[PDB]
Amino acid sequence: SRIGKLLGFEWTDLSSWRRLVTLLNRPTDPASLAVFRFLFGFLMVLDIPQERGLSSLDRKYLDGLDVCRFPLLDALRPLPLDWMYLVYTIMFLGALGMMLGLCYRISCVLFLLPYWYVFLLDKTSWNNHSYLYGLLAFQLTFMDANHYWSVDGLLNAHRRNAHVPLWNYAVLRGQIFIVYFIAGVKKLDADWVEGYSMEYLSRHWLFSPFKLLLSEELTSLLVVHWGGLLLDLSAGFLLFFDVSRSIGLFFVSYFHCMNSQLFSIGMFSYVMLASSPLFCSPEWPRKLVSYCPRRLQQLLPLKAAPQPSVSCVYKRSRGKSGQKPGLRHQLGAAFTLLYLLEQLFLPYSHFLTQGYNNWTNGLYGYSWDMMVHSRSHQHVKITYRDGRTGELGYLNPGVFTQSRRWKDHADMLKQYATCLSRLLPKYNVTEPQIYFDIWVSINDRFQQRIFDPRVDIVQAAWSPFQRTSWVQPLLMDLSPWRAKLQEIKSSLDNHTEVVFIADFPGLHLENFVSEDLGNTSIQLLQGEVTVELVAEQKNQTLREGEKMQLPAGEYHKVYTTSPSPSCYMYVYVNTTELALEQDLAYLQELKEKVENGTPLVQTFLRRQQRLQEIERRRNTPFHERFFRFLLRKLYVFRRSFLMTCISLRNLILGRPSLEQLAQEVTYANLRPFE
Amino acid sequence: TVFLDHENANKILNRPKRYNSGKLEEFV
Ligand SMILES: CCCCCCCC/C=C/CCCCCCCC(=O)OC[C@H](COP(=O)(O)OCCN)OC(=O)CCCCCCC/C=C/CCCCCCCC
Ligand SMILES: CCCCCCCC/C=C/CCCCCCCC(=O)OC[C@H](COP(=O)(O)OCCN)OC(=O)CCCCCCC/C=C/CCCCCCCC
Ligand SMILES: CCCCCCCC/C=C\CCCCCCCC(=O)O[C@H](COC(=O)CCCCCCC/C=C/CCCCCCCC)COP(=O)(O)OCCN
Ligand SMILES: CC(C)CCC[C@@H](C)[C@H]1CC[C@H]2[C@@H]3CC=C4C[C@@H](OC(=O)CCC(=O)O)CC[C@]4(C)[C@H]3CC[C@]12C
Ligand SMILES: C/C(=C\Cc1c(C)c(O)c2ccccc2c1O)CCC[C@H](C)CCC[C@H](C)CCCC(C)C
Ligand SMILES: *[C@@H]1O[C@H](CO)[C@@H](O[C@@H]2O[C@H](CO)[C@@H](O)[C@H](O)[C@H]2NC(C)=O)[C@H](O)[C@H]1NC(C)=O
Ligand SMILES: *[C@@H]1O[C@H](CO)[C@@H](O[C@@H]2O[C@H](CO)[C@@H](O)[C@H](O)[C@H]2NC(C)=O)[C@H](O)[C@H]1NC(C)=O
Ligand SMILES: CC(C)CCC[C@@H](C)[C@H]1CC[C@H]2[C@@H]3CC=C4C[C@@H](O)CC[C@]4(C)[C@H]3CC[C@]12C
Ligand SMILES: *[C@@H]1O[C@H](CO)[C@@H](O)[C@H](O)[C@H]1NC(C)=O
């Protein structure tokens, strides 16, 4: 058997459906599966009050406030606040039951259903690790993970060390390998292989040892980008094979420990750290409990040979001939194959749902593309026209929204426009027509429009499977300007700002320059533009390299007259801020020189107080910050528990008068002890 | 404030906000 220890099976095991079913139902030790179940349940229990939003349920789902919401299906609606609290309570009970191993399958369903309901209620909170938590719960619902270290065995002789089928480990290993490979297959973009995605990450103090032998640019390009891509592409292969398992384990442990401190991503790094020993032998916890000293080997459960179980199948040369697979042995193999195929296909299915394709493909959350694209937003304008009188008005951007992801997607923009159209008649506005003007730059590009500003979105056509026509294409043949843009930006002072704009032919930009923005100019970089002064009604054509000075406190318009897109930039300085800073410096220097020999004073003293606080925090040890962190966490947990108790009591018995409820609310918001 | 005036709705060269980093993967 040449290949019988590098892969775990032989080529003859895949020569028939029956042989494949026999191979995939091979009995296995369940200890590692049990440890993983315990750890995932604990992590989900800890995660529910923090990231799932139990501590802000009253703020999010108030009784009678006007909110625009973005569900995947518009038919999906939230429940009243008390029923929302009940849903969260059921989810928490399910997570606790999953962790303990008590009533395993009912607990699995009780966690799985409200979690996915909450996920599908709101598209603006989707990310990759929440999607992964849902997928893992779905997998664990169909697994025999309560056969070792549960409470079910310590009450029912059947689930005390029994065997499990082989595909339970196969599905989990395939899932972890998929995410790793998929993540390393989406990092083959030129915006990442060229060092644009995370250019400021290497400035952290955690990259100091690399700077000893490398420069800043070289440590940003060599280590953060290419090193990360290599780790992503090689982690699964390194972990699969046992000759490289220790090296791979050390690398992934360092990677996830670094990521836990670099970002704020909840419990994703710890789930990834805990999912790595699933690649080792299924019996490693037994060896670990055997290696410990004998003085602690008499209180833990005894180590014995695992008992036979009905879930798996037994093929022996002398122990009878064979058992014909039933309806349970073939279903596991079919589920494994189909689930792995679907997990492989879904991150590459964007050619079918074209109505969700903006500058970036698909909705964010299920494609394993983390930290590849970074967005900057310069300006948002919303304008309406009254349908009965005809006046024009302007709205504050994001009035009835609780998030900001509506500026990048056309489906969310359509939902927001419909919500605004339905809610505006409450403010003496007849059937309106709404227009949007949003300026975005992606990965340090030219700022441009994403949507057509001349199209009314209330009547615009949107379909899930049709490409949207009112989305402005990304100007790809302008990216090589980035080096010149960085040169220009670095060639400025400490009180001068610059904005780079790319405009489409046939459109125009209306801009009101603030009164305090003295010394504002515009320089043409490509194409041709015309600048119109509104007060003086005077036009002026510009050619490449031309610079023009603009007045403050007035209106001006820029017209794009080239047959191709044109690029220009704004240079401006806050004259009021400059004068205030210089006179503050004058006054402070004079006072200090006299000593050694009024909003500005307030700002300076508060800045000095901030610096003193920062210095004191730097000088103090980390134990005080640890105590503060623990106090904050305990406050969050206590408030969540008290709110849940109040809501449950209201639901079960009945709401009291408007005094006891206020007293309870005031009591719950009390800090435990300072 | 639900509504804006013409002058304040066209102030393009203003500080946007820059709410920390706040990338799509982070929770914060
Ligand atoms: C060639 C079949 C795939 C095997 C991988 C070959 C080398 C590539 C390395 C990939 C890294 C991780 C892949 C995901 C792991 C899942 C498979 C797995 O666990 O196999 C091992 C396991 C034996 O375990 P132990 O003996 O403990 O091995 C540990 C010591 N090496 O073997 C099996 O699971 C037998 C199952 C055979 C494969 C059938 C199911 C897996 C299917 C893979 C993808 C499914 C897509 C189907 C393709 C359809 C169109 C062709
Ligand atoms: C069921 C839960 C599955 C989702 C799980 C989440 C993770 C998976 C990630 C993928 C999510 C993105 C793709 C979603 C699939 C399609 C969504 C969908 O049908 O509903 C969207 C859309 C609602 O639009 P909103 O933007 O809410 O409204 C804005 C207007 N004010 O739905 C509708 O318009 C109703 C029509 C539903 C169509 C039913 C689709 C089922 C399949 C139809 C048959 C197959 C079609 C094949 C090609 C058809 C070509 C004509
Ligand atoms: C086969 C699997 C084997 C795997 C082995 C590999 C090892 C696994 C790796 C570690 C897994 C566990 C780690 C989980 C714990 C760490 C999580 C953590 O530190 O999260 C903190 C969050 O902090 C907490 O979660 C604090 C929780 C408070 C402590 C709770 C644990 C102590 C429980 C004691 C036992 C139970 C007590 C019962 C009392 C109640 C009785 C009525 C991150 O902070 P954020 O808030 O993101 O900070 C960023 C700021 N925006
Ligand atoms: C003297 C008076 C003011 C009594 C006030 C005490 C409160 C501060 C106590 C009462 C209920 C306690 C809570 C009861 C239950 C839990 C569940 C417990 O859940 C777990 O996550 C532990 C198990 C795990 O780690 O999975 C965490 C502590 C917490 C929030 C406790 C935190 C402290 C609370 C709010
Ligand atoms: C920002 C980065 C990745 C985005 C990301 C994150 C945050 C994850 O959580 C992922 C989890 C699973 C799969 C993919 C993930 C993912 O794509 C690279 C971060 C840069 C990294 C810290 C550089 C360190 C790697 C080099 C090789 C260090 C060298 C090792 C020394 C000990 C010599
Ligand atoms: C208005 O601002 C511009 C740009 O900030 C100033 O132009 C700079 O002038 C100094 C010399 O005074 C040069 O060293 C810089 O190279 C110039 N910058 C650019 C981008 O050309 C200009 O001086 C300012 N005008 C006033 C009256 O303050
Ligand atoms: C400055 O020149 C621009 C050139 O685009 C003029 O913009 C046009 O103005 C007319 C006025 O009715 C509109 O009908 C056009 O749609 C505008 N655009 C184009 C491309 O023609 C602008 O009016 C001129 N301003 C002054 C004061 O002469
Ligand atoms: C309380 C009620 C509404 C909850 C209803 C939950 C239903 C809708 C949930 C339960 C399990 C979920 C599925 C679990 C796993 C997957 C595979 C993934 O690759 C795409 C989503 C998909 C297909 C989910 C779709 C939604 C789903 C079917
Ligand atoms: C800086 O400019 C902005 C507008 O560009 C203005 O609101 C702000 O007041 C200026 N700073 C000071 C200190 O006045």
- Asked if A95 and A136 touch (Cβ cutoff 8 Å), the reply is no
In angstroms, what is the span from residue B14 Cα to ligand 7's centroid?
27
| Adjacent-strand bridge partners of A447 | A501
Q: Which tokens hold the place of A621? A: 């040890």
Chain A hits for B20, CB-CB cut-off 8 Å, are none
Q: Is A496 in the pocket of ligand 6 (CB under 6 A)?
A: yes
- Domain extent, residue B9, equals 1-28
Chain A hits for B16, CB-CB cut-off 8 Å, are 376-379
Question: CB distance A395–B25 less than 8 Å?
Answer: no
* Binding site members of B: 19-20, 25-26
In angstroms, what is the span from residue B28 Cα to ligand 5's centroid?
20
Q: What angle do CA A398, A263, A607 make, to 5 degrees?
A: 70
Structural domain count of chain B: 1
Phi, psi for A436 (deg, rounded to 5): -125, 140
Phi, psi for A515 (deg, rounded to 5): -65, -40
- Asked if A571 and A515 touch (Cβ cutoff 8 Å), the reply is no
CA A342, CA A610: separation in Å to the nearest integer? Answer: 53
CA A195, CA A199: separation in Å to the nearest integer? Answer: 6
| Method in brief | cryo-EM
Ligand 5 atom closest to the Cα of residue A231 is: 27
Of all residues in chain B, the one with the smallest CA distance to A405 is: B24
Task: For chains A and B, count residue pairs whose Cβ atoms are closer than 8 Å.
Answer: 68
Specify the length of chain A in residues: 674
Resolution of the solved structure (Å): 2.6
Q: Is A138 in the pocket of ligand 8 (CB under 6 A)?
A: yes
Count of alpha carbons within 13 angstroms of residue A559, beta-carbon side: 11
Pairing outcome for strands A566-572 and A520-526: antiparallel
Burial group, residue A549, by CB count within 10 angstroms (0-12, 13-18, 19+): exposed
Phi, psi for A25 (deg, rounded to 5): -105, 20
- The yes-or-no answer on residue A591 being catalytic is no
Q: Is the dihedral of CA A620, A625, A626, A627 positive or negative?
A: positive
**CA–CA min distance A662, chain B (Å):** 28
Question: Shortest CA distance to A466 belongs to which of A411, A505, A516?
Answer: A411
Greatest alpha-carbon pair distance for chain B in Å reads 36
CA A70, CA A92: separation in Å to the nearest integer? Answer: 25
Residue A240: other Cβ atoms inside 10 A: 16
CA A321, CA A314: separation in Å to the nearest integer? Answer: 9
Burial group, residue A19, by CB count within 10 angstroms (0-12, 13-18, 19+): middle
Of all protein residues, the one whose alpha carbon is nearest to atom 17 of ligand 7 is A559
Breaks in chain A after residues, C-to-N cutoff 2.5 Å: 597
B5 touches chain A (CB under 8 A): yes
Q: Which tokens hold the place of A40? A: 């995932």
- Collapsing DSSP states into helix, strand and coil, what is residue A292? coil
Q: Which tokens hold the place of A513? A: 């320059």
Burial group, residue A605, by CB count within 10 angstroms (0-12, 13-18, 19+): exposed
- Asked if A243 and B5 touch (Cβ cutoff 8 Å), the reply is no
Question: CB distance A427–B27 less than 8 Å?
Answer: no
Query: Which of A179, A263, A380, A404 would you mutate first to test chain B, the one with the most B CBs within 10 A?
Result: A263
Q: Which tokens hold the place of A192? A: 């990442």
Write down the residue that tokens 């209620």 correspond to. Answer: A121
CA A239, CA A251: separation in Å to the nearest integer? Answer: 10
> DSSP state, A301?
P
Pairing outcome for strands A497-503 and A448-449: unpaired
CA A428, CA A549: separation in Å to the nearest integer? Answer: 42
Phi, psi for A374 (deg, rounded to 5): -125, 130
CA A456, CA B25: separation in Å to the nearest integer? Answer: 32
Q: What angle do CA A204, A209, A215 make, to 5 degrees?
A: 75
**CA–CA min distance B2, chain A (Å):** 6
Amino acid identity, residue A508? H
Q: Which tokens hold the place of A250? A: 């050390």
Q: Which tokens hold the place of B26? A: 């982070």
Helices (H), A424-525: 482-490
CA A398, CA B2: separation in Å to the nearest integer? Answer: 9
- Asked if A356 and A362 touch (Cβ cutoff 8 Å), the reply is yes
Q: What is the 3-state secondary structure (H, E, C) of A307-328?
A: ECCCCCCCCCCCCCCCCCCCCC
CA A87, CA A664: separation in Å to the nearest integer? Answer: 21
Q: What ranges make up the beta strands (E) of A515-618?
A: 520-526, 529-533, 541-542, 547-550, 555-560, 566-572
Of all residues in chain A, the one with the smallest CA distance to B1 is: A396
- Collapsing DSSP states into helix, strand and coil, what is residue A669? coil
Residue in A123, A186, A187, A407 annotated catalytic? A187
Q: Which tokens hold the place of A466? A: 């049709």
For the residues of A113-171, what is the DSSP string, one character each?
A: HHHHHHHHT-GGG--HHHHHHHHHHHHHTTS-TTSSS-SSGGGSTTSSSB-B-THHHHH
- Asked if A43 and A140 touch (Cβ cutoff 8 Å), the reply is no
Question: Shortest CA distance to A410 belongs to which of A466, A371, A493?
Answer: A466
- Asked if A130 and A154 touch (Cβ cutoff 8 Å), the reply is no
Amino acid identity, residue A228? G
- Residues with Cβ < 8 Å from A203, sequence gap 6 or more? A216
A200 touches chain B (CB under 8 A): no
Q: Which tokens hold the place of A480? A: 């090589």
CA A48, CA A266: separation in Å to the nearest integer? Answer: 10
Q: Which tokens hold the place of A233? A: 């592409």
Q: Which tokens hold the place of A44? A: 């989900």
Q: What's CA A160's distance to the chain center, in Å?
A: 39
Of all protein residues, the one whose alpha carbon is nearest to atom 15 of ligand 7 is A506
Interface of A with B in 35-54 (CB under 8 A): 51
Q: Is A117 in the pocket of ligand 8 (CB under 6 A)?
A: yes
Of all protein residues, the one whose alpha carbon is nearest to atom 51 of ligand 3 is B28
- Asked if A478 and A445 touch (Cβ cutoff 8 Å), the reply is yes
CA A627, CA A618: separation in Å to the nearest integer? Answer: 16
- Collapsing DSSP states into helix, strand and coil, what is residue B4? strand
Q: What angle do CA B11, B14, B19 make, to 5 degrees?
A: 130
Q: What ranges make up the beta strands (E) of A186-323?
A: none
Question: CB distance B7–A512 less than 8 Å?
Answer: yes
Q: Is A414 in the pocket of ligand 2 (CB under 6 A)?
A: yes
Q: Is the dihedral of CA A614, A619, A622, A628 positive or negative?
A: negative
Question: Shortest CA distance to A565 belongs to which of A440, A497, A476?
Answer: A476
Of all protein residues, the one whose alpha carbon is nearest to atom 9 of ligand 7 is A559
Q: Which tokens hold the place of A334? A: 């079919």
Question: Shortest CA distance to A557 belongs to which of A523, A508, A507?
Answer: A508
Question: Shortest CA distance to A370 belongs to which of A347, A350, A349, A354?
Answer: A347
Amino acid identity, residue A403? S
Least distant ligand from the CA of A517? 9
Q: What ranges make up the beta strands (E) of A392-543?
A: 392-395, 433-442, 448-449, 497-503, 508-512, 520-526, 529-533, 541-542
Residue A606: other Cβ atoms inside 10 A: 10
Q: Domains for chain A: give ranges and CATH numbers.
A: 28-165 (no CATH), 374-474 (no CATH), 482-576 (2.60.120.10), 598-674 (no CATH)
